Design a protein around this nucleic acid. Structure first.
Ligand code: MG
Ligand code: ZN
Ligand code: ZN
Lengths: 133, 263, 392, 56, 43, 181, 30, 65, 114, 49, 147
RNA sequence: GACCAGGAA
């Protein structure tokens, strides 16, 4: 029912090799130097150039078919500008207090290096991604 | 003015260039399909042949006879022979044409659609007269004769639609375009160097604003506005192909409700 | 001819109109069949016993994975293959309107619209995603193609988890009839039955999607761009020089024979090898130049038809023609054709075809190509007969 | 070799093939014409007796 | 019909291959495929 | 064609000159100066395989005659006329071809056997085989209802009367994936 | 200039007059 | 073998236009790409229909009974 | 020879009905109508219009084989709302739209002088 | 347009298909391979024209 | 079959409304698969098309004679002069939906030939029928009603 | 029905 991870990042690079509409993104955290990010992103839908400072959330909610409209009358867990829904598919222990999680948003991939949100990121198909700014 | 709109860009006996606006593409397309496929027309559908001394075979000629456009204006007040009550056909459901031709001249003698003549009773409705757009008013050159070449046959035209045979198609090609600056990205341009340089702009580029590159892609967008052009073979006047198609389609969508109701 | 078990298989009848036997496109290959006019026999059992034998032993689904090579002997092919690639790129997204049709089209579908990979701005699905609606659960498959991370950077390999595509493009290596097979697995894992259902499902979706994407190919796709063209011409040019030299060398008696070869046998080995290096380089030159959007390269990448060498001779250079291994003979005294001077050991004289198929062959090139070609047709019709008796 | 190890046979048919994206893998489209020629000998039984009479 | 009247048969050390000498006299391409490949030539 | 150095005025050159070409087509428009004309004036000559051995042939003439004392990218790559020793010229390379083959368009752009097929398949095609078809009682024959001459043609078609008695129709063709049908 | 060099297009004219004389079945007849 | 009524592809009426196209040629000494266009044949399916037609009937005619 | 009659594309076969409605077993409040003697013209058009109905949760159609003029249409709606009525409403919508379209073209065409 | 060059025998049109053969009165030498007592042979197939 | 050894049977017929269309209202008579071309390398087909498209537009006979100075480049230039894109592609719209095809199609005239092999002359079925006398096995050949 | 001959995926 609740959020799983939260931080602001800043992009080191935007790569669109061979892809008309998608770019893989490279950011690191403002708070932790320990905290990196790699993210395939739909630029057509939400464009990006480097140095952009993006906020990034996770959360498991806000099972069953997907209902489209009426969302005027709905609790959009978005105060955001772009939201995906993917699957956790690798928990890579990279030494130390250091860990990485791997997500797949129907092909759009994501890798997140960090430490401390052990008590958070489960191997859940239920994993929504969120971006503002 | 109401719902979907029209602006007409050019018009003739046999060509309506216009713009559909404020519509589902699916709708615009359905009209296109209907206009081609489902508007009723009269065309010769049976040919009994009494004599043929031509270089052309009986059925070879028969086939051509199906392709001559016939006056189909008041076609809606002719019955489908299938539903008419006579065994075979009558005056209520069919037009009877007759063709007699003989090589009188030494020079080659020509059999044109003008040489058809309606034997059946028209009950005074616009029907069966072969369409002639011809400059010298001869219509389709059906066949050629030499001397003892005689052609004597009889035609029964019936009501029908393109779905059953194309001979009943009131319209020829129908030009249909939208979003001439690919702003919906509904197509991805093949190119060697410059998608812009290799691909020619459409006439309709003039009728929409160029996209201007300093712009984020509009995913919200959706195809309304459609540049069409209808061309009539002549069996029905262009404007009517549009209308009757609109009407024909509607009648369909209606019959659905109607069955929904006997349900 | 019927050289396989698989060359006669039991099918379910579906009485239909028109005068052709119609069959599923994927069972095309174990029969060896193409619709360029080939007829097929159908026998009908008469006993309760014999139909049993058919449905229980030699039904198409059973014959999928095959003992000829411990792998599946049919897989996704042609349009459906060419399309399944295009469908599953990262690039490829699908609007709600369409998605709904693609789902319904899958005749099994739990009636559950899966959550779009992108929920706003504007909900989009991805090819990967809705394709997986066809792949059943518990179908677990993983392959690494060269340079694959778990964060597959190039959409390489294949990561399918519980019948969900996680990354990588679906194509021949996956959805074809490979050992690693998406097919090999589904059969061995779910049933002959489930797998045969899979074929159907995959094609209904892909074909549908491909119907509305469209796919084509034209002369445009054989055009090697300006610089890459010129650059090919020099690749050939320089190797023509490489030959001219080894020729001069062997004309002054400087050249030394290799062990076992004539002074001459040795010379030709270099020439033939120089001219094939030439062609092959010019080939790779073009292949690299061709954009991802090039339809021919697209067919090659899916593995739906064609290969490097086809691109090579269409775009770059046809290459050296050969009869009986050696280059072209002197059928005429000391020359290949009466349009040449004598003792001409050059590439032009002995049947190197400098030109691409796009540029078109010279009349000499044409005739030598012809000579080589005829040798082909013969040892085809030969290896046919010899193959037959062998099999018997 | 040609009369015993092989034979021409009854209840058989042949015609041009074409492929179908809409058939299932393990079926084959048979022309109505051939369906009407080709026969299966079915034994009258209480299970089929009415259906069988219907076809006859 | 034409091509049938410019047709050559060649009964029965290597006849089937397209020879150099055949230049300009016989078609490099127009031959039957199979039992009579290169054995039936066309002028 | 016969070539001799036979020119006070310059190098080696074909006996046949543009004057004969005039004189030739003069007689063409008249539907005197026949083929047999070229043959007794000795501008042209018959060569079997044996005699072929001992000559040297230029492919094109004009191209393979005057020396040299920019180049098209798109075009193919032709060799040269480095030889001075020419005896004869090819009348036109396209005549190494047979009848069937002479209908194949751009066949010099095809994989070699793709030609060998069509130059057998076209003999299983359909069209108007003779204009007297109506009066002949051949056991089996097919005529095309509306034959068309082809939009793309061979210069050699002229002589085969292919334009006047065709084999097919010009179909508006799309190379596309559609229904997978 | 009725003794000019001959162009490539000109060869066809000759080829034309060949078939005027021989026709396509020269051999079978002769 | 005589002009098609109606172009295969689009269906535009074409059989009336034959003698005109022949006259736009002989008498007017127009070339084909214009003669066709003068007859309002524009979509090239209709162009090919006339431009590539071989009117054999005129030969068939020359035989007798 | 094995070609069906061409009118079979539109003339209802004897003892056939335009609509047959059966309910989707796989999911709640959803239903599958088969349109006999019909094709894309009607199918795409109705699908298109149900996609405007806010209370429609799902809409698709398919011509399962091209040999046969017919199509299945699947409709799911928010509960209470009956897909049958959903179809009803969508239909009139199309009609009214075409009504304007007719009226409007006529009205413009009246103004031409050619 | 008929080009002739055929025969009409009992109604059906017959074509005489050209026959290829080695020319005669011609001198040719061949190597007679390994297992032979002969090593080279000069043949001439000779005949009255 | 085209003149490039591209034999095909029909697989289905579609009426105009189902056929993909160029905005110009044009529609194919015939749709061949793209997978014909690469393994067969029958480039001449493609050129025949590009050339024939010009010829139809220009009403000038297309020379596809063998060894000549005609280049695909040359042809492409003319075709662009005529307004269609240089390589004979053309945007096409789906017949069922009216939506554009995401791909552009190679599209143009190409001489095709009707071949003497027609299916209703081929199709054959038997289930009990005339038997040989000597062997008492089924007789041979469609004609004779064989097995 | 023997037998010969010619041509096809
Ligand atoms: Mg085959
Ligand atoms: Zn009546
Ligand atoms: Zn047309």
């Amino acid at each position: 029912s609740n959020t799983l991870f939260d931080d602001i990042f800043q992009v080191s690079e935007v790569d669109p090799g061979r892809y008309n509409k998608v770019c893989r993104i490279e950011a690191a955290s403002t708070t932790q130097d320990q905290c990196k990010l790699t993210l395939d992103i739909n630029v057509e839908l939400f464009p990006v150039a480097a140095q952009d400072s993006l906020t990034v959330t996770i959360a498991s909610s806000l099972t069953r078919s997907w209902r489209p409209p009426q969302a005027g009358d709905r609790s959009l867990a978005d105060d955001y500008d772009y939201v995906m829904y993917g699957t956790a598919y690798k928990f890579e222990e990279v030494s130390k207090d250091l860990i990485a999680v791997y997500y797949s948003f129907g092909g759009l991939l994501m890798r997140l290096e960090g430490n401390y949100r052990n008590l958070n990121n489960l191997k859940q198909e239920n994993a929504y991604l969120l971006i503002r700014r | 003015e109401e719902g979907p709109q029209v602006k007409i860009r050019e018009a003739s006996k046999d060509n309506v260039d216009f713009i559909l606006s404020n519509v589902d593409l699916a709708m615009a397309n359905s009209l296109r399909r209907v206009m081609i496929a489902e508007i009723p027309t009269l065309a010769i559908d049976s040919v009994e042949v009494e004599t043929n001394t031509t270089v052309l075979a009986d059925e070879f000629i028969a086939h051509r006879l199906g392709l001559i456009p016939l006056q189909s204006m008041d076609i809606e007040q002719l019955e489908y022979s299938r539903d008419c009550f006579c065994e075979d056909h009558c005056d209520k459901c069919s037009v009877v044409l007759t063709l007699q031709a003989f090589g009188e001249s030494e020079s080659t003698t020509n059999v044109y659609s003008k040489d058809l003549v309606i034997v059946s009773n028209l009950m005074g409705r616009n029907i069966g007269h072969p369409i002639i757009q011809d400059k010298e008013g001869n219509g389709v050159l059906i066949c050629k004769l030499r001397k003892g070449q005689e052609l004597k046959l009889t035609c029964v035209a019936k009501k029908g639609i393109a779905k059953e045979h194309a001979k009943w198609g009131p319209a020829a090609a129908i030009e249909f375009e939208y979003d001439p600056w690919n702003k919906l990205k509904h197509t991805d341009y093949w190119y060697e160097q410059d998608s812009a340089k290799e691909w020619p702009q459409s006439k309709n580029c003039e009728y929409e604003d160029p996209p201007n590159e300093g712009d984020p892609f509009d995913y919200k967008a959706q195809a309304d506005t459609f540049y069409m052009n209808v061309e009539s073979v002549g069996s029905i006047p262009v404007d009517q192909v549009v209308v009757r198609g609109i009407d024909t389609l509607q009648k369909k969508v209606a019959s659905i409700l109607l069955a929904l109701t006997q349900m | 001819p019927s050289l396989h078990k698989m060359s006669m298989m039991a099918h379910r009848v579906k009485v239909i109109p028109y005068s052709t036997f119609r069959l599923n496109l994927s069972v095309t290959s174990p029969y060896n069949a193409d619709f360029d006019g080939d007829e097929m026999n159908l026998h009908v059992p008469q006993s309760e016993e014999t139909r049993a034998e058919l449905s229980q032993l030699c039904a198409v689904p059973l014959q999928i994975v095959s003992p000829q090579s411990n792998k599946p002997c049919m897989g996704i092919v042609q349009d459906t293959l060419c399309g399944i690639r295009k469908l599953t790129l990262r690039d490829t997204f699908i609007e709600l309107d369409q998605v709904l049709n693609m789902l319904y089209w899958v005749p099994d579908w739990d009636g559950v619209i899966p959550t779009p990979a992108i929920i706003k701005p504007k909900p989009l699905w991805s090819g990967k995603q809705i394709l997986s609606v066809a792949i059943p659960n518990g179908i677990h498959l993983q392959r690494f193609d060269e340079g694959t991370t778990l964060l597959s950077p190039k959409d390489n390999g294949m990561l399918i988890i519980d019948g969900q595509i996680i990354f990588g493009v679906v194509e021949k290596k996956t959805v074809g009839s490979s050992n690693g097979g998406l097919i090999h697995v589904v059969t061995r894992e779910k049933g002959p039955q489930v797998c045969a259902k899979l074929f159907g499902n995959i094609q209904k979706v892909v074909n549908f999607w491909l119907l509305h994407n469209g796919f084509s190919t034209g002369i445009g796709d054989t055009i090697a761009d300006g610089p890459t063209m010129r650059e090919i011409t020099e690749t050939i040019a320089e190797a023509k020089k490489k030959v001219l030299d080894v020729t001069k060398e062997a004309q002054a008696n400087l050249l030394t024979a290799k062990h076992g070869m004539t002074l001459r046998e040795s010379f030709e080995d270099n020439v033939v090898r120089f001219l094939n290096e030439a062609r092959d380089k010019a080939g790779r030159l073009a292949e690299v130049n061709l954009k991802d959007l090039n339809n021919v390269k697209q067919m090659v990448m899916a593995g739906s038809k064609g290969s490097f060498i086809n691109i090579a001779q269409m775009s770059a250079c046809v290459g050296q023609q050969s009869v009986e291994g050696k280059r072209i003979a002197f059928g005429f005294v000391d020359r290949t054709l009466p349009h040449f001077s004598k003792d001409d050991y050059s590439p032009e004289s002995k049947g190197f075809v400098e030109n691409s198929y796009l540029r078109g062959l010279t009349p000499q090139e044409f005739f030598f190509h012809a000579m080589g070609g005829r040798e082909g047709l013969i040892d085809t019709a030969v290896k046919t007969a010899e193959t037959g008796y062998i099999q018997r | 070799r040609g009369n015993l190890m092989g034979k021409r046979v009854d209840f058989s048919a042949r015609t041009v093939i074409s492929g179908d994206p809409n058939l299932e893998l393990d079926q084959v489209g048979v022309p109505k014409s051939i369906a009407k020629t080709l026969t299966y000998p079915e034994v009258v039984t209480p299970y089929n007796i009415d259906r069988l009479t219907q076809l006859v | 019909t034409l091509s049938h009247l410019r047709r050559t048969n060649t009964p029965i050390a290597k006849p089937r291959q397209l020879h150099n000498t055949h230049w300009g006299l016989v078609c490099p391409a127009e031959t039957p495929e199979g039992q009579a490949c290169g054995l039936v030539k066309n002028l | 064609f016969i070539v001799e150095d036979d020119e006070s005025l310059g190098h080696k050159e074909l006996k046949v000159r543009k004057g004969h070409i005039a004189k030739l087509m003069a007689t063409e428009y008249q539907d005197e100066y026949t083929w047999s004309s070229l043959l007794n004036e000795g501008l042209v000559e018959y060569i079997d395989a044996e005699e072929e051995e001992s000559i040297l042939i230029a492919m094109q003439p004009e191209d393979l005659e005057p020396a040299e004392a920019d180049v098209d990218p798109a075009k193919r790559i032709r060799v040269s006329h480095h030889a001075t020793t020419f005896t004869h010229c090819e009348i036109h390379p396209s005549m190494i071809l047979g009848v069937a083959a002479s209908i194949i368009p751009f066949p010099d752009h095809n994989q070699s056997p793709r030609n060998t097929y069509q130059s057998a398949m076209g003999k299983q095609a359909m069209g108007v085989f003779l204009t007297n078809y109506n009066v002949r009682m051949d056991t089996m024959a097919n005529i095309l209802y509306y034959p068309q001459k082809p939009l793309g043609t061979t210069r050699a078609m002229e002589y085969l009367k292919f334009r006047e008695l065709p084999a097919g129709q010009n179909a508006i063709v799309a190379i596309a994936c559609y229904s997978g049908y | 200039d009725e003794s000019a060099p001959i162009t490539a297009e000109d060869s066809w004219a000759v080829i034309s007059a060949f078939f005027r004389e021989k026709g396509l079945v020269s051999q079978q007849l002769d | 073998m005589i002009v098609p009524v109606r172009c295969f592809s689009c269906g535009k009426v074409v059989g009336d236009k034959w003698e005109s196209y022949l006259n736009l040629l002989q008498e007017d000494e127009l070339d084909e790409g214009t003669a066709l266009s003068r007859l309002g044949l524009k979509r090239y399916c209709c162009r090919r229909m006339i431009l590539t037609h071989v009117d054999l009937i005129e030969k068939f005619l020359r035989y007798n009974p | 020879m094995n070609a069906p009659d061409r009118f079979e594309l539109f003339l209802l076969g004897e003892g056939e009905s335009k609509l047959k409605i059966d309910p989707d077993t796989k999911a709640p409040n959803a239903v599958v109508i088969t349109f006999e003697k019909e094709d894309h013209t009607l199918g795409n058009l109705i699908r298109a219009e149900l996609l405007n109905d806010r209370k429609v949760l799902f809409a698709a159609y398919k011509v399962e084989h091209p040999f046969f003029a017919r199509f299945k249409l699947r409709i799911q709606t928010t509960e209470g709302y009956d897909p049958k009525d959903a179809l009803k409403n969508a239909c009139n919508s199309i009609i009214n739209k075409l009504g304007a379209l007719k009226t409007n073209f006529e009205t413009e065409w009246n103004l031409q002088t050619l | 347009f008929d080009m002739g060059g055929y025969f009409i025998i009992n109604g059906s049109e017959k074509v005489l298909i050209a026959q290829e053969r080695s020319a005669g009165n011609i001198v040719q030498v061949f190597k007679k391979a390994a297992p032979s007592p002969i090593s080279h042979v000069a043949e001439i197939r000779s005949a009255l024209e | 079959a085209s003149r490039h050894g591209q034999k095909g049977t029909i697989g289905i017929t579609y009426r105009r409304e189902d056929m993909p269309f160029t905005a110009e209202g044009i529609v194919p008579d015939l749709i061949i698969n793209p997978h014909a071309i690469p393994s067969r390398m029958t480039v001449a087909h493609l050129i025949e098309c590009l050339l024939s498209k010009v010829a139809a537009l220009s009403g000038n006979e297309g020379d596809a004679s063998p060894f000549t100075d005609i280049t695909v480049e040359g042809i492409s230039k003319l075709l662009r002069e005529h307004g269609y894109q240089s390589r004979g592609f053309e945007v096409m719209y789906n017949g069922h939906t009216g939506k554009k095809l995401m791909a552009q199609i190679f599209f143009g005239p190409t001489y095709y030939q009707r071949l003497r092999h027609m299916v209703d002359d081929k199709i054959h079925a038997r289930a009990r029928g005339p038997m040989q006398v000597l062997t008492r096995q089924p007789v041979e050949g469609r004609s004779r009603d064989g097995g």
